[model samples]
Each structure stands twice: as structure tokens, then as C-alpha cells.
Target: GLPNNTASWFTALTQHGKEDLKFPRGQGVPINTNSSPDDQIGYYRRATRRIRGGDGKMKDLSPRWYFYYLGTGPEAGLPYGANKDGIIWVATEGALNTPKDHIGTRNPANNAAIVLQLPQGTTLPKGFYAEGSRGGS
Candidate 1:
């Protein structure tokens, strides 16, 4: 069973080896760097690949859907942060149009969601701070 919002942004992934094509051409655009942080360079690179259009060259079919798991924990591998694991699976191709069984994590249990909320003034471990220093108590 799937949600009512399922749709496809691109054509269905075909096995005929014609995967190097963009269905909704110009549907996506590059991100503006004006207010972006200098440290966000790596994020921009990955976003570019995902939003890039076909180059008329042979390439494997991109995933019909894009799943984004928003963990309440610090990004992915962050210490001192409890993995509050909030997961979201986006139907990149569009809602239900993309094959549900083929998209997202292999673990069926993972498909189901679990939400967690952290309270204010949560004290993270001293060394786990990504940027700021631990204030003196």
C-alpha cells in the first residue's frame, strides 16, 4: 500500500539501455550560492548529480524515487547525538507512479516511521560539538 501523493517526475526506468535521458527537461535548476555557507560545498556537489539532466550518453537509470531520512540525530554519524531517526521517502519520479517495491531501503521495517522529539537544553557531550565550544557552566 502507498500514499495518495505518489507520482513520477521522470519516465519509468526501462531496461532497454536507454536510461541516459531526461524526461522532464529543465524541471530542476541549480541551487543559488548567494546565502549558502562555504562549508556547504560538498552538499552542492551531491545535489548537482541528483538534479543533473541527461548527457545523451549511456548511464544506469537513476532511482525513480529519492528517499530522504531526516534523523533527529546529528546528520548521520555524529557522536553525543541520539539517533532520533525521522525518515522520509520521496517519490522523486512523482507519487505512486514509481514502483514502490523497487524504491527505498530494502528493510521493510525501515519503511515504517518512528518520530522522536528532543527537548531544549539537551546537553551533548563536550567533544561531540561539531563547531561551537562547550560553554562554562
Candidate 2:
């Protein structure tokens, strides 16, 4: 996929929220014994953190989150779950004026086609890594 000089990369770098802590196991914070460890933010937090956000103000990273699927074959990028290499990128709910802070692909601003897939058989860019590689090969 082509390098996006957009904002979604920033959310991938910042914007992401941390997992909310589990319930207390004592009085005033009773443990209901119903917690099943379905906690998901743990994954999202780690995923987002892996992507470098660079220098920016916290406010620039918005509360809303966006997810882009890295497809295979015609749209060959890694799947979201397997993107330990930061293959997936994120976006903001709206446009941001700061590019130096890292303007990512804007949510909705990218047509459905833009977010969904790159041109078929697109070669991985020169500096990017495949799913398992430490760096672009």
C-alpha cells in the first residue's frame, strides 16, 4: 500500500485509550464474580502503542477510534489481528490541521475504496515490512 501522509497514522500512534481496570474484589468495590476477562482494550492499547505517533499534543489524538483492515491478495496487507508489525493504520472522526504531528488518513474522508484495499498486487512499499519481518525487505 502507498504511504498515506494522512492523520489515521496518528491515531494508530496516539488517540487510543487504555483498558479500563477490572472490578474491585472487596467492599465498596465488590467483585461480582461475573468478570470473564472479555476485556478488549488491552489488545487495542498494545496495538496502537506499537505504532510510533511521533511528537504531538494529546488533544490532537481524538476520543473516537477507526479501524482499517489490511487485506491480502488484490488488497495484500496483513489482517488486523496479525499486524504486530503495525501493518494497520488508524484515523480520526474528522479532519485535523496538523500535519507535522502526523496527519493520518481521515475517517470517512477516505472513500470506501481507499480504506478497504490498495490497487491489486500492490508491492509493499520500500520501507515497510511484511507481517512477520522486522523491517521492510
Candidate 3:
């Protein structure tokens, strides 16, 4: 069961027939559930910056970036459990307006995507649930 007021914002971003979502920075690393046990979770940060053109030079007017989590998980069809290996879930909720220097890129006015990291072999059932820290759903 979901907590009070926490039932609305949580939504499933993936569909049943769709493949696992892949990240752009997941190079060299296997972004799939078939990785070895020693494989470590990788974190990538992405952000869009506004550049200012001045004096034939471009400067970053607004710098933005956020941490992206990548890891293998049981729910992703791996043989390990949540304790051994788990799905990599990424989050950018609290990162809003946190400043690029601090590694947060989301604007306070925008909503963020909440990604869930699940263990290998663990199946995610279709359902909606709250993901952000906002008290009410």
C-alpha cells in the first residue's frame, strides 16, 4: 500500500513490450542485466546550460547537471538478488534548483523523473506509486 497523499505522482515510465531504458553515458559499461558480479554501478550527471555569447566567446550563463545512477538489478532479469546486485534507479527530484556546482541541474519550476533501481531477476509489476519527497502525492 502507498502512503497517504503519495499515490498520484508515481507513474510507470516503461511499457511491457519496451526494452530496458538506456542512458547516453553508459559507454564501456554494460547497461544490461547480463553484467558480471564485480560490475560496479556507474553514476552520470546531465544538464542543459544557457550560454552567453560575448566578445566572440561563449560562456555558460547557467550551468546545470545531475547525477545519473546505473547498475544491474534482479528485477531487471539478473540472477542476483537486491543484496548482491540491483537495478539502477536514477533520481532528479530534490536536485531542482540545487545549483550545478552542487551537482543538481533541475530547475525548481520543473518536475523531475524518478527512476527506480531494481535487483536482478526482480520483476516490476505495472502500478503507480509516489516517488518524490513531496509530502503529499
lDDT of the candidates, in the order given: 0.23, 0.26, 0.28
Per-residue lDDT of candidate 1, residues 1-137 (tens digit):
34223222111212223232222322221122221222111000011124345654444443321212211111322222133333222112322222223222233343433221112433322222212233677
Angstrom error of the Cα, residue 16, model 3: value is: 34
Cα miss at 58, model 2 (Å)? 2.3
* Worst-scoring 10-residue span by lDDT in model 1: 39-48
Ordered list by TM-score, greatest first: 2, 3, 1
Error of 1 at 14 (Å): 10
Summarize candidate 2's per-residue lDDT along 80-117 as a digit string, tens digits: 23545322333222312222211122243444222211
Q: Give residue 28's error in model 1 in angstroms.
A: 15
Alpha-carbon RMSD to native, per candidate = 20.0, 20.1, 19.2
What is the Cα-based lDDT of residue 134 in candidate 3? 35
> Of the candidates shown, which would achieve the greatest TM-score relative to the real structure?
2
Name model 3 segments beyond 4 Å from true: 1-37, 51-64, 68-131
- What TM-score does prediction 2 earn? 0.21
Candidate 2 weakest ten by summed lDDT = 26-35
